[PDB]
Amino acid sequence: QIDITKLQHVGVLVNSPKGMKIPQNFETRYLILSLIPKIEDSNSCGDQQIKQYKRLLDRLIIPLYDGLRLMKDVIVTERFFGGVIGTIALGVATSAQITAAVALVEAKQARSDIEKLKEAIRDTNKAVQSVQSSVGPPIVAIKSVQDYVNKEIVPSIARLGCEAAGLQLGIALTQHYSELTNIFGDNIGSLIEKGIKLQGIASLYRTNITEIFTDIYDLLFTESIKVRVIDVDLNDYSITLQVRLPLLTRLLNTQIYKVDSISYNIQNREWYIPLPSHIMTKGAFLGGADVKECIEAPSSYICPSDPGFVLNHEMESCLSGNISQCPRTTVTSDIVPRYAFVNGGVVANCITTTCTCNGIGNRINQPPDQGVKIITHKECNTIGINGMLFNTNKEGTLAFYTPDDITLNNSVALNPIDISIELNKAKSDLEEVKEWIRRVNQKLDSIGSG
Amino acid sequence: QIDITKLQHVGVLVNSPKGMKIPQNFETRYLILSLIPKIEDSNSCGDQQIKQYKRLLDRLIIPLYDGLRLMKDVIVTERFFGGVIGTIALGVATSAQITAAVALVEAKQARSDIEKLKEAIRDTNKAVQSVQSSVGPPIVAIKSVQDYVNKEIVPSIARLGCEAAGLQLGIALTQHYSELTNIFGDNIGSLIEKGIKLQGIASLYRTNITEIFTDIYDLLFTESIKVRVIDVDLNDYSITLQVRLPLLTRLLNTQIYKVDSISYNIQNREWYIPLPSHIMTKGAFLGGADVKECIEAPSSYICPSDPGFVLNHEMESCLSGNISQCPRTTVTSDIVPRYAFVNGGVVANCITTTCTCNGIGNRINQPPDQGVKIITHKECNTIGINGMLFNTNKEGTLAFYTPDDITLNNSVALNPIDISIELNKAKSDLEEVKEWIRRVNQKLDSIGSG
């Protein structure tokens, strides 16, 4: 596991262990976006704005439908446990496409209940409606702007007439088109393959997900996961969605640690160890964690899948406490911290930070061969960093550092220019070596001839 | 051209040939955003919110005007075919700036018709208006919120008075400012040089582009191309735009192919060929295609310009079927597919995928020296991958693979850390070689002296 106490000696501050939660399973639910609102004018006044809005929906619903038809790459035994899902198709489908096609053929049995339900949702005015079935969960349908239509436009058609009611529809529906376009328009193939974040659709429709389908961070995670488009009705302008309620389990014996690298001095130049922002353990395992897609709760990270990736370099040996193998890289800017509070004391490179021990006049100098200064409460009662006076914590666990000849031979560059420059220098040295070899071989030929 | 059948043996799945459409020419049209709506209160009630909205427009229109004045870098024979466009200016202008200045001096002849039209648009209340001229196309003007003003605020000034009418104006106009800021505020120099996507302005103003100026994917492409700002009136708060209606032609003898790389096993480790996501042919030519800015129609990619870039590496030889030169790289995560359906069969590396031939109990083992397993319908009737049973397609064209000693010497890294680490190892070996050379040269001196 991580040797946190030794990693501090190179400014690597492994901190904040949090557990990790993974959805072992998903409860599925269906959501039907019925994109056309019903009007009650009894004279087809709103039809003119409905027609142009339909003519806008085409710009999103037809690309979405044409994208979904590519997911018909499993051709259809089925209906039997461990039977054949279907016949492959003449094309190429990657594992992501195959997984999406399998999810579609799992949902395809809904389509007869879809046919049953649309007969209702075609007629109803109610904005959010749920329909029961022989299948366990209720299926819910949202009719896009019905609250606004029945509560505002239905009165306005009488109070203000067809002119204002028509403009109100035009504005509201083209706004709803801009919202739908923000949800459905970008990366359409990925949006079909991987789905749409439930957060966006709920923001479209203020959907009380827990009330519609059934901790704050668990709810945020439920918003972050992607609902898959399972059908798109081009004639009824309806999109059917699979919502995926996660069953979260706390994964045992896992911790995700944050690692912050401060600048490390080598001969009055600033270097740092460019470790990934997060690292994780799984019993004996040690690797990075791509927490970027996860929800950081206060006690655990809720992730859609195990974010761990194995550290390919000596970085694993570095983190395991074999400090001599840590890869150095040069600091570029103020993004790398020059100091940090650690376990009640301070770890900083006092060459580029005015470290003071018991007052702004007593500077804590570090020798040029020491990379970071570890200032425990036993050393200094009131450490001042860049003038900022702080008391060190008397119950701090920051272990005292007897300095040592830590030599970090693994100098590494993050910039392609640096690598190209030093590779050109290596290639020039290699050419010099080849020239020497040619000359010595010629000399060998001459000595042999003689 | 691509040797698709041989590329499969390294998990490179070249697929989905689509043609390519390029706008050989653009029909120009002019659009005048008249940012101030006219009021009809007959008492200047709305003036207070108009003044503050003008005071907001300054935050975008003045930067936009000051940006456009830099495009006055051609100084002004003109008016004669093949005559001098103008005198250069004392500064530096790159080819993009020169192209934008040339486009501005082409549009500059509109400015007398602009002066003629603004006399009308200053007075009219109508939200979208078109004006004819001696030049061929109508020029259209949009007065920002006139529908809302005349249909809602003009009634409200009488029904609710100056107080509510004023608040309605304040809210609507500052919303319109946030929309304008979303369109005009970012990357102002690029926005002047390259223009604004017509999609955004149409979303601002629900503009029926085909109705205003004249297939769904052709319309999407017309939305994706950039309208250039040609004038900005700081006193009238008016922005004049050049809309560019593309004349699309299907380019002959071009195909764009998608390429998906699955993991390829070398000695129980996963590798892949990091080819670009799309490749294109142009007769004998073979290169990549930067389709990111193009519209993917079902039969062709509509691109603003030829996206092709020549493959600088042995990647061209790799794609041409000289498989031994394909560059390997190590897999990093689940983003690289471990298997894919291909032409009715399956191509997968069965070392990290439970491939089964005619039932979940008959695993299709592959020898450690074979990188991918190609499972044709002649081999297996019902291939199961990770438990998922699928029938292979009896009309599939997936050619049967007799395995061979495919050796891929071009090991390549995508991560600067890997390159730096192995360059440091190379440099250390080079230092060892130099030390040996110094020792041998010293020995040569000693033998010569003796």
């Epitope: 399973n25 998903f26 461990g82 799992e106 | -």
Partner: nanobody, 116 residues
Framework: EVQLVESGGGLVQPGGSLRLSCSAS????????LGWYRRAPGRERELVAS???????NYADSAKGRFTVSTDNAKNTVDLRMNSLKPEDTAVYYC??????????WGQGTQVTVSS
Amino acid sequence: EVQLVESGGGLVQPGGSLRLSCSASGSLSTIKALGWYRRAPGRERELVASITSAGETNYADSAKGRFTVSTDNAKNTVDLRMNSLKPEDTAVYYCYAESFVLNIYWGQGTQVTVSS
């Protein structure tokens, strides 16, 4: 969607044996595993037994070797055979079907109880 229909529960004498039979229907070709969960009072749903389509079977430490689970794939039924029933085994048993995409489907659950 997978319809799960649990059956065979009720009261039984302690130390007795019982067979719980769940009928599954729908797109079962997409189902990775069929099995049973239990929910005792005051605790979450614990796994009881599961059968993968490959036949591979697993159990919780409370169930290993003690219980046995079976299917009759000709009729899509999954049966859990209960034996040596204890007071500690009383719970609502929930049949489940788990998809390859890790969706989970549940039966209505059957009450299992034992005499005092």
